[PDB]
Amino acid sequence: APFAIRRLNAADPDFGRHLDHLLSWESVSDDSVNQRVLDIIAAVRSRGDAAVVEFTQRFDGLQAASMADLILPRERLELALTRITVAQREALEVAAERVRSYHEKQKQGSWRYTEADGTVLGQQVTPLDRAGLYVPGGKASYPSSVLMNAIPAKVAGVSEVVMVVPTPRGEINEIVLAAACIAGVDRVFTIGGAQAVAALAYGTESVPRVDKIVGPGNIYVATAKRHVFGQVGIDMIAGPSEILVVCDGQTDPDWIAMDLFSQAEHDEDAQSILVSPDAAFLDRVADSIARLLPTMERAEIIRTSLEGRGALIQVADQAQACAVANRIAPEHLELSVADPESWLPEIRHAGAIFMGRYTAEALGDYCAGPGVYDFQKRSSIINCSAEGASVLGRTASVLARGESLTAHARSAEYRILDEK
Amino acid sequence: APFAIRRLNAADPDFGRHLDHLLSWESVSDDSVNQRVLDIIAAVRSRGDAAVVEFTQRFDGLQAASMADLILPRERLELALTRITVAQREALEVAAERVRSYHEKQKQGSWRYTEADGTVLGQQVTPLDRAGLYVPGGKASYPSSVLMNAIPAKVAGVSEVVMVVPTPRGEINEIVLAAACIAGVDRVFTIGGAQAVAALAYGTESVPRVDKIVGPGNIYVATAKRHVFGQVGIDMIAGPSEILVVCDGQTDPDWIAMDLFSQAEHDEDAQSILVSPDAAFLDRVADSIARLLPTMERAEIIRTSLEGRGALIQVADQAQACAVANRIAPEHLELSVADPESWLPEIRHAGAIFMGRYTAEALGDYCAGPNHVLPTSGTARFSSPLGVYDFQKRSSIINCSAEGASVLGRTASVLARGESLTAHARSAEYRILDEKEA
Numbered sequence A: 001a002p003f004a005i006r007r008l009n010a011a012d013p014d015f016g017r018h019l020d021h022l023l024s025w026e027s028v029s030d031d032s033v034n035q036r037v038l039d040i041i042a043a044v045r046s047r048g049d050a051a052v053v054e055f056t057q058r059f060d061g062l063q064a065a066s067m068a069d070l071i072l073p074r075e076r077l078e079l080a081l082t083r084i085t086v087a088q089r090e091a092l093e094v095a096a097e098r099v100r101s102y103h104e105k106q107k108q109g110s111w112r113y114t115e116a117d118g119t120v121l122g123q124q125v126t127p128l129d130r131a132g133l134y135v136p137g138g139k140a141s142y143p144s145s146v147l148m149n150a151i152p153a154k155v156a157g158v159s160e161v162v163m164v165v166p167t168p169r170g171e172i173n174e175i176v177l178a179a180a181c182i183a184g185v186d187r188v189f190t191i192g193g194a195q196a197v198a199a200l201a202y203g204t205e206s207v208p209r210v211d212k213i214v215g216p217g218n219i220y221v222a223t224a225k226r227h228v229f230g231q232v233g234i235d236m237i238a239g240p241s242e243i244l245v246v247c248d249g250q251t252d253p254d255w256i257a258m259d260l261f262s263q264a265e266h267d268e269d270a271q272s273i274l275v276s277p278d279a280a281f282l283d284r285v286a287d288s289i290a291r292l293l294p295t296m297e298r299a300e301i302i303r304t305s306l307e308g309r310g311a312l313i314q315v316a317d318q319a320q321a322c323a324v325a326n327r328i329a330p331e332h333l334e335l336s337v338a339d340p341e342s343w344l345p346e347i348r349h350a351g352a353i354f355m356g357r358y359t360a361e362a363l364g365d366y367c368a369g370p371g372v373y374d375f376q377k378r379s380s381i382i383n384c385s386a387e388g389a390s391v392l393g394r395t396a397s398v399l400a401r402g403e404s405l406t407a408h409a410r411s412a413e414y415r416i417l418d419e420k
Numbered sequence B: 001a002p003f004a005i006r007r008l009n010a011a012d013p014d015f016g017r018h019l020d021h022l023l024s025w026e027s028v029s030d031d032s033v034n035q036r037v038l039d040i041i042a043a044v045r046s047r048g049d050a051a052v053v054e055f056t057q058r059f060d061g062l063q064a065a066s067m068a069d070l071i072l073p074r075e076r077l078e079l080a081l082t083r084i085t086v087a088q089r090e091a092l093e094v095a096a097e098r099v100r101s102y103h104e105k106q107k108q109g110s111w112r113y114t115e116a117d118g119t120v121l122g123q124q125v126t127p128l129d130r131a132g133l134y135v136p137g138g139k140a141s142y143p144s145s146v147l148m149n150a151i152p153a154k155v156a157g158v159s160e161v162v163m164v165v166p167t168p169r170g171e172i173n174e175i176v177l178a179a180a181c182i183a184g185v186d187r188v189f190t191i192g193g194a195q196a197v198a199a200l201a202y203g204t205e206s207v208p209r210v211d212k213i214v215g216p217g218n219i220y221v222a223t224a225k226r227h228v229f230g231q232v233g234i235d236m237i238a239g240p241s242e243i244l245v246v247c248d249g250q251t252d253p254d255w256i257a258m259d260l261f262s263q264a265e266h267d268e269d270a271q272s273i274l275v276s277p278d279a280a281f282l283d284r285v286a287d288s289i290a291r292l293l294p295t296m297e298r299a300e301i302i303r304t305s306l307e308g309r310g311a312l313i314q315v316a317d318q319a320q321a322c323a324v325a326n327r328i329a330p331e332h333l334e335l336s337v338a339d340p341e342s343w344l345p346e347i348r349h350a351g352a353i354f355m356g357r358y359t360a361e362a363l364g365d366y367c368a369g370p371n372h373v374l375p376t377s378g379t380a381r382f383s384s385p386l387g388v389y390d391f392q393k394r395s396s397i398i399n400c401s402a403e404g405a406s407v408l409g410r411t412a413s414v415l416a417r418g419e420s421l422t423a424h425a426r427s428a429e430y431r432i433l434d435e436k437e438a
């Protein structure tokens, strides 16, 4: 044999050393991935479509004579919507309505405000022209990620939402494609990895250059986004798939085991960690892991993730549990404790938080629905009246002259009215 | 020998390439400036404090034996406050009042909301632990930048606001340090360039690793900020110093020439361009420039920048003026026209906009942030993720009731099972409750 999950104890004097290592895992080195991503980016900029096709065959195991075989018509998204089940389609449509209604209320357009002295301030707001959405291929690709990125882009007025979704060995995810259909994706290319990000950032003969790339992605996508920042807007660099469970010991150990498995099954570099002051509970979770793992469809992925990056960590009390959690700074925190609002203040470095025994971290990947700002460009506007320029100019005049910026000062002074 | 501003005319058939070269020529390469930056970052990541002191001696020309001589105590900020004149201190205090008022109105905190089924949703809002503020050295450092960044950080509750400001040959801008005192800066290091950015992004023995780096910067700072992206939060990376003025010819030509000088006096590489359909006007601006330039206090820097990147550009009409403006794509646009809101629909690539004849682009550098709205009580009503939001972290929370977990769990089960992610499914299914189960 049974699988034995790694065990750490913060009562060990050397516990900080093992925790550091657990948090700095170089499966494939940063440097190796970085060089590979840099080379692919430069390759896509130099050779365009030909490079995209060549990398797609190599990394996605796909046969494609040309870039035209890597274009999915929007009609294929409509077909996907007919192919999923009644219950799947209803879940997606219900979540879409809630996401879309929410963003309609939050949208803020151009505005102007007139001060008492006549000065007008405000912002001129324009949708981005195009936005690119990365969608991981295959089964481990949450449809919520499509809905929650494409819908606010369309609500903002983005004319073209371009989706890139690799098809590993030709595999297509109909639920994901159906979500893309509901969310209003305009164009789809079956490409992935660093080459998809590069094609979106710089453009090729067939892939349009977009103004912002959004979405999740593994280390190749994250590294490519880091490197095309500047050339294109980027929402964020999502970190590796991750869950920290903190438990007081009074949650069912099968539930906790499964909560760890939920993240570990996403991909082989996911990290799942449990922290608890309850030693007997940690033993129960270790047994649950050993028993439940061979019953999992994705046991191979789950085992590899837990061998490389998982751990159960014993701590002394609530205070130490929070200190270790804050150090881990988890992107996803499950506070499986009696009074979660009592633990959160001591874990300010955590990302998304799932509270209590009844809130599985997995619900965060399949959110049923409740932004636009991130798909808009803003120009700030100042239109002083003569009186407003006098008020502002008096302050600027003094400060500028103080540091010898006399063109700044005289520029402002030309519009200062003399007082009564 | 009166100065003759460079003249361009869109009617010329070499205009596209002539303007292309004016907009793109570079002294040092991208690769060499970028290569020097990549080297400096690796050096301070490796040699820590020693690299910072070495780069500071070489590039700033400072006689500093160790990192402890590059630390300015908070008292030195208070002393700056007493060294500036009364009118300068009050001007800093007035500016800080307007900034601080605005950010207080914008500040949002944590919240919770209980759904009908008992599920609690919300957000936990906390300040960043530490923020790092880059402040240019010398006289060309806007005190605005200190106020505009340190004040929202303190209003957010950032417990340690760290400022870096190079002091070339020991020169100190007392107004800038006084601004830092008023804005509540906690610690100051007299360092700059890429090495300052890297010391803040990664931390050294004496410089603390901060959660976000903000502020303006020259090419080395901007390049360094681009490279430490993903390693540490950053704000918008400011581009090179630049102004495009578009005028219909109905603005006093001296005002326009001085608006060009305002940007030109910042540094030798600054780019100041005027576009107009009014040919007689453009001549009056050329004369204004010749007459006004000699006695500018920074006449030599203005002349250098106008020679290298300045231009007066003749166009056929308003539409061609806007086409040229769109090709330049200015981060700072001065629409010095009678009807500025009529020109804006045809301006599609522009950052911050100064409208009409009474709005000098100089006011941008002293009363607003980079492409930020002017802070007033009225403008505070319009939300922005800039400002106090910059320096805060937001954690979404969900606390399902048993019934909420059941409703959400069924939908999670359907979609996760549809994708064969059965750990997701079973984890959600464990919480589904059926009252009739004994």
Ligand SMILES: Nc1ncnc2c1ncn2[C@@H]1O[C@H](COP(=O)(O)OP(=O)(O)O)[C@@H](O)[C@H]1O
Binding pocket: B036, B055, B059, B060, B135, B136, B137, B138, B140, B166, B191, B192, B193, B194, B195, B217, B218, B220, B221, B267
């Ligand atoms: N040629 C260079 N190589 C490396 N760093 C440089 C070079 N020129 C300037 N720097 C860095 O940029 C800083 C210049 O001071 P700063 O005020 O921030 O920019 P500026 O004065 O041009 O506006 C220096 O501290 C220095 O570290």
